[PDB]
């Protein structure tokens, strides 16, 4: 199907404890492949997937140089944002940045993005035309003015439409065994009484890739959205994912309830039944 | 300031069989800000060699982390995950339940 | 790979 490359950057001020924390991670789809950690000893961009280890020394030296430039900008940004919002040195604050590109099943460019957040909420984001900005408040408007005058969007568009997709395709080919695979979920339902008149029905999906999946309960064909407990899709640790959805039902009504599983690795959506 | 509570899941990588080596996971997602303490417990005691994933975040900007260790389930050993975060008035302990 | 230009906010 479609594919994505995304870089995630987390920057955290640490009042009275010196330099801020800086963590960068890169993903292709749901597979991480690089990291940089300001608190680690190496001070290098490091591999986190087997298929990126084959990149040569120029790759690792260059990515280390560039991630440190990201770190330096974010270090300055924390001070700038203190000024924009008239905030004291006493509090810790969080900057997050995410950018990347998506391609379709034909591997052609679908969309690019670059999003920036301060203390957990939208700050500024590149719009989908890759030519203009959405500024979430008045402080972000200041950034917007500065980024328009410095033609930041034009350089970002060139990266997102060119470099980003070219290297995403390279990674997809070099790691095709890992990245171009689909593991269909292994599904079942469990049944456990919570009393003499009610039972928990839990619909399970295991060992699937990629992480995108939909689990739904129906009662006589009607969606049970408000009565379903749906846990966050979670990593198994081996490159696959797990998820479950549960309802609590009156004992004896089990046959009314069906679980429905959607995943791109299934030939067709699955319906699991108690009869 | 925005604060979001961690959603904590404790589970094994593979279906648990007594005496068979497995992996114990504590996945903590949806939290903000990023400072968080996560410990895996064996019979109430902190497990020493626990690794964790590199900090990342979801579309809504909330963070997620996987803590994990190799383990061999038994009949008697109780496993759990202990999480503290600014959104939690006290540390939260989630017990591993292998019969879900 | 990363983008090479990272302009300050
Ligand atoms: Na706390």
Numbering used by the authors:
A (entry chain A): 1 to 275
B (entry chain B): 1 to 100
C (entry chain C): 1 to 9
Study text:
We developed a rapid procedure for accurately modeling large numbers of peptides bound to the common class I MHC protein HLA-A*0201 (HLA-A2), which was applied to a curated dataset incorporating thousands of immunogenic, non-immunogenic, and non-HLA-A2 binding peptides. Yet for a peptide bound to an MHC protein, the impact of features such as exposed hydrophobic surface and charges are determined by the peptide's conformation within the binding groove, as well as the size and position of the various amino acid side chains. As has been noted previously, nonameric peptides bound to class I MHC proteins adopt relatively conserved backbone conformations. Our hypothesis was predicated on the notion that immunogenicity is influenced by both peptide binding to the MHC protein as well as TCR binding to the peptide/MHC complex.
As we intended to emphasize structural differences emerging from amino acid mutations, we further narrowed our database by pairing each peptide/HLA-A2 complex with at least one other in which the peptide differed by only a single amino acid, either as a substitution or transposition. The utility of these models is found when comparing results for mutant peptides and their wild-type counterparts, as the models can indicate the types of structural alterations that impact TCR recognition of a mutated vs. wild-type peptide/MHC complex.
